[model samples]
Target: NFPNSTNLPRNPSMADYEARIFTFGTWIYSVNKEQLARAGFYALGEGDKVKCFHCGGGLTDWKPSEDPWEQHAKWYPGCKYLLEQKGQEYINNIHLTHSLEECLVR
Candidate 1:
């Protein structure tokens, strides 16, 4: 089953909700932008909140596989909370997604 959870208040008001998820490049397949977007704002334009050091554009920023756990070392610097919720919908199956990684890396 799918379970949705938030780190912030269970019932945060509009002001209390977290800000956008910023990225510079295409998101890795395993990462679901839709799931994360629910918790906060998602930038639709180019600006400070969404810029990539490597690519200098806001198309794809975070690597889902690299920072899925969002520990300090691999974490993206700008976001307040780096970890985004993972959902089954984002993947057809775990083995399928991981196996697909080879194709993606290429």
Candidate 2:
């Protein structure tokens, strides 16, 4: 089952916007940092690695055109914060679209 909690972020220390945003304060790497914070990601240092404060999921390797929310949904569809902010349909769609793109490329 997918995680369902929403009141508090899974990682307590990075609960608020400021806390999460500060994780990117030093700017180890880049791309839509503010949006990433809004989606619950905190910078993990080196090559843009970031961890979601809600799902405890780690992500890196970002492209400029990629959206924070889309990446979050694409990588960690089971994330509670993702489910809360967006619905299952949104998550499913991203995965479907991503797989389709890979398939077309192949």
Candidate 3:
């Protein structure tokens, strides 16, 4: 559930910093944890940089279901991205990257 990668800005604020993250093209099996770790993160995959539009929560550890549609739901189907507002459609667009989650460690 890759949100908006190409549009991420140079500097992001606190609100934007807490957004969820997922890649755009990679999958969980073919994910690169080292790359994310090297970049400083928990994990990395295609379409992995997903975000929660409601609470700015990161979407990871996707779980596929028994149904075929469920499989599609596993990755695609739009991951959760906590938004600034209930009806807003703008992603953080900030360079949250791997560090975004790190800041949450506190």
**After aligning candidate 3 to the native by TM-score, how far in Å is the CA of 15 from where it should be?**
14
Order of quality (lDDT): 2, 1, 3
Q: Pick the candidate with the highest TM-score.
A: 2
Candidate 3, residue 64: the lDDT equals 42
Better of 2 and 3 by lDDT: 2
In candidate 3, where is summed lDDT lowest over 10 consecutive residues? 79-88
- Candidate 3 has what TM-score? 0.21
Per-model RMSD to reference: 11.6, 3.1, 14.7
Question: What does candidate 2's lDDT look like per residue over 9-80, in tens digits?
Answer: 678898788998987876644477888899889887667888888877778788768888998887777778
Model 2 deviation from native, Cα RMSD in Å: 3.1
Estimate every model's Cα lDDT from 0 to 1. 0.34, 0.81, 0.31
lDDT tens per residue, model 3, 1-106: 3333222322233222223123233345443433332222222233544332222224454434222122222222232221212112222222232247558895
**Superposed model 1: Cα runs more than 4 Å off:** 1-30, 39-41, 46-60, 64-106
